[PDB]
Copies of this chain bind each other. A is one copy, B any other.
Amino acid sequence: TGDLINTVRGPIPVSEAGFTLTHEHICASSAGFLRAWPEFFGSRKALVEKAVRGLRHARAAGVQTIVDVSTFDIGRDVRLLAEVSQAADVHIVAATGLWFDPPLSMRMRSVEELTQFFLREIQHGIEDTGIRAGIIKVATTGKATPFQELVLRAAARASLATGVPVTTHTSASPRGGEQQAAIFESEGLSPSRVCIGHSDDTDDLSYLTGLAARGYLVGLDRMPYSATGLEGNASALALFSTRSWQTRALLIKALIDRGYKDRILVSHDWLFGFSSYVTNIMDVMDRINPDGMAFVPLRVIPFLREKGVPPETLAGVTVANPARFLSPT
């Protein structure tokens, strides 16, 4: 009680976030795209309706909060987030930061300028909406580019100023997480403010326990991205692993069994629209995972419980760890 987090509908008590998915998207797009070309998604109205149905399904399954880690260059539309949050009765935390598609107007900026932009979105609000980011999303693509280093440093600085956590995208080992950690630490950022994302891309337990031992949160955040019979489909095969989802889920158990239950965040990296990839990709995705963002609560959590993970431990992972991560600290 007492701690607050910013959502797209305003401030909420941390203790009300409940079962929280820490890496999700309503729509993965590009800056300006939803506004310039809503018909790409059928219509803005069809996108809202699909997202609200999806989030109502997740809510029925026990999900109370999602963290939408869509940055400016993922075409985050905070008005869309607010509308869907209100219609679905699911809290949504919005993000600042930058992903791997920054336009020239971002790429030309200094660390100090990027810091000011992240702080504006956290402290003032996004665009002219007054809605404030509750997380900072950064991405490196293999070995950090020089601009990516600036982004990571600007993220660390904005976090230090605000207590808001940082969450990352990594390529599949690299293993890019270690370089990100090195940059964050050089800026004096506490690892407990940081989630190293897409850490389920590989079953490298030494990499993962290495990060966890240092205080980092490990984002096991692509839980439903497993499929069979996609070889005649190059673009779909790129997204979906041959590893069963059971294998991804066993990584959560592996980390719990090694003493790191407090260092784990679980999510889907799901979405209801996707213009930054091939056309009609959603048809493929929705056929594979019709449960959408209810996949974790419906499938992953019962599987772990059935494998002997205690309910208190599962509660800790899905409720306590997100609460501690999101609480400005």
Query: Could you list which residues of chain A lie within 8 angstroms of chain B, going by C-beta atoms?
Result: 29-33, 35-37, 39-40, 72-73, 75, 101, 103-106, 108-110, 113, 117, 120-121, 126-128, 275-279
| Complex interface: chain B residues within 8 A of A275 (CB) | 104-105, 108
Task: Report Cα–Cα, A137/B39, bound state, in Å.
Answer: 22
Q: Is the CB of B72 within 8 A of A32?
A: yes
Known: A39-B120, A120-B39. A33 touches B276 (CB 8 A): no
Task: Report Cα–Cα, A46/B30, bound state, in Å.
Answer: 27
Q: Is the CB of A101 within 8 A of B101?
A: no
| Residue of A113, A276, A278 with most chain B CB atoms under a 10 A cut-off | A276
Q: Is the CB of B127 within 8 A of A36?
A: yes
Enumerate the 5 nearest inter-chain pairs by beta-carbon distance, A residue then B residue, closest first: A31-B32, A30-B103, A30-B105, A32-B32, A104-B276
Pick from B101, B117, B126: contact of A103, CB under 8 Å: B101
| Complex interface: chain B residues within 8 A of A109 (CB) | 279
Q: Is the CB of A108 within 8 A of B31?
A: no
Pick from B29, B106, B117, B121: contact of A105, CB under 8 Å: B29
A129 to chain B, nearest CB (A): 10
Task: For A235, give the chain B residue with the smallest CB separation.
Answer: B108
Task: For A103, give the chain B residue with the smallest CB separation.
Answer: B30
Pick from B29, B31, B37, B113: contact of A33, CB under 8 Å: B31
Task: For A276, give the chain B residue with the smallest CB separation.
Answer: B104
Known: A35-B128, A120-B39, A127-B35. A105 touches B75 (CB 8 A): yes
Q: List 22 A-B contacts (CB under 8 A).
A: A30-B103, A30-B104, A30-B105, A30-B106, A31-B32, A32-B32, A32-B35, A32-B103, A33-B103, A36-B121, A36-B126, A36-B127, A37-B117, A73-B103, A75-B103, A101-B104, A103-B276, A108-B276, A108-B277, A108-B278, A109-B279, A113-B279
Task: Report Cα–Cα, A109/B75, bound state, in Å.
Answer: 16
